From a paper:
We then resolved the crystal structure of HsiE1 in complex with the N terminus of HsiB1, a TssB homolog and component of the contractile sheath. We crystallized HsiE1 in complex with a peptide corresponding to the first 20 residues of HsiB1 (1MGSTTSSQKFIARNRAPRVQ20) or an HsiB1 degradation product, which appeared during purification of the E1-B1 complex. Both the E1-B1 peptide and E1-B1 fragment structures were solved by molecular replacement. In the E1-B1 complex structures, there is clear electron density for residues 8–20 of the extraneously added B1 peptide and for residues 8–30 of the co-purified B1 fragment, respectively. Both structures are nearly identical to the structure of HsiE1 alone, with an r.m.s. deviation of 0.4 Å in either case, and to each other with an r.m.s. deviation of 0.3 Å. The amino group of Lys9 of HsiB1 interacts with the negative dipole of helix α7 and forms hydrogen bonds with two carbonyl oxygens at the end of that helix (residues 155 and 157). Another key residue for the interaction is Arg18 of B1, which forms two salt bridges with the carboxyl group of Glu273 in HsiE1 (top right inset). The residues of B1 between 8 and 29 that are involved in specific E1 interactions are highly conserved (top). Residue 273, which forms two salt bridges with the conserved Arg18 in HsiB1, is always glutamic or aspartic acid.
Residue numbers in the entry:
A (entry chain A): 30 to 286
B (entry chain B): 8 to 20
The structure:
């Protein structure tokens, strides 16, 4: 029934049912792993972390997953602080001068200086190089996040750390379709950097405002939309000169300088 | 417009 409720996008109803199942079979690690993922979809971060902790104690073979997603949940708090203009994220790879105005714009937004923040973003965008490439086989002249607070920047979690990766530093990105429920929140990825470095990563798959301001459909990534505030919720969306591609429909992204 | 989504209508996914 919980799977059915989830399919229908009835998150609260699903949560009710699943917690009753766990209460009935408290030693069942499979149910608690389901519950952690559902809690994460709903943005109940501390309760999600609680379930992970219990899973690690019930099944020591799940401990690597537990470490990975416990730190991923920690990163969502860091995410909030970065977009609130209160924290500088880790920057991956070669330094990019135009990242600084992007970050400063977040601070200026926080202080109600939206026009000045807009000016800094316009400058950052102008300075960031248009790098051609392809999404699978489909060419583009440039690519960015539909979120103007990022533009040509990818949010990543690497080794449990929240970071910004300028797309100009990226050679290729590979992802698969989401498979587990937690993949709607953090999509596993392989990244190769232009200067050679390669690493596995998690990609925060929804916009940061989704948990608080989105509806159930948004939290499940079944829509992308912009709030009256001007901020996006729902599934991450990439835009190019030629079209747009939602994250869960991306498989391979290659840049060719 | 470089890096800009021209459309901000709600998207179905």
């Amino acid at each position: 029934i919980a799977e059915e409720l989830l399919r229908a996008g009835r998150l609260d109803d699903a949560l009710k049912a699943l917690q009753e199942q766990v209460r009935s079979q408290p030693s069942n690690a499979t149910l608690r792993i389901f519950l952690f993922q559902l809690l994460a979809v709903m943005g109940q971060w501390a309760r999600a972390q609680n379930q992970l902790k219990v899973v690690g104690e019930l099944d020591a073979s799940a401990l690597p997953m537990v470490q990975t997603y416990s730190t991923a949940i920690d990163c969502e708090a860091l995410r909030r602080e970065v977009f609130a203009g209160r924290l500088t994220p880790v920057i991956l790879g070669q330094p990019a001068e135009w990242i600084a105005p992007l970050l400063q714009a977040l601070s200026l937004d926080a202080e109600g200086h939206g026009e000045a923040a807009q000016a800094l973003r316009e400058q950052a965008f102008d300075a960031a190089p248009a790098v051609p490439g392809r999404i699978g086989e489909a060419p583009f002249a440039w690519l960015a996040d539909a979120d103007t607070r990022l533009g040509p920047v990818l949010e990543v979690i690497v080794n449990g750390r929240y970071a910004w990766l300028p797309m100009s530093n990226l050679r290729s990105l590979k992802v698969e379709a989401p498979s587990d429920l937690r993949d709607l929140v953090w999509l596993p990825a392989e990244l190769t950097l232009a200067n050679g470095g390669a690493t596995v990563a998690l990609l925060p798959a929804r916009y940061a405002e989704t948990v608080e301001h989105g509806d159930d459909a948004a939290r499940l990534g079944r829509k992308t939309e912009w709030l009256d505030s001007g901020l996006p919720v729902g599934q991450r969306l990439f835009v190019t000169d030629a079209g747009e591609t939602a994250l869960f429909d991306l498989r391979e992204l290659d840049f060719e300088p | 417009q470089k890096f800009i989504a021209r459309n901000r209508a709600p998207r179905v996914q």
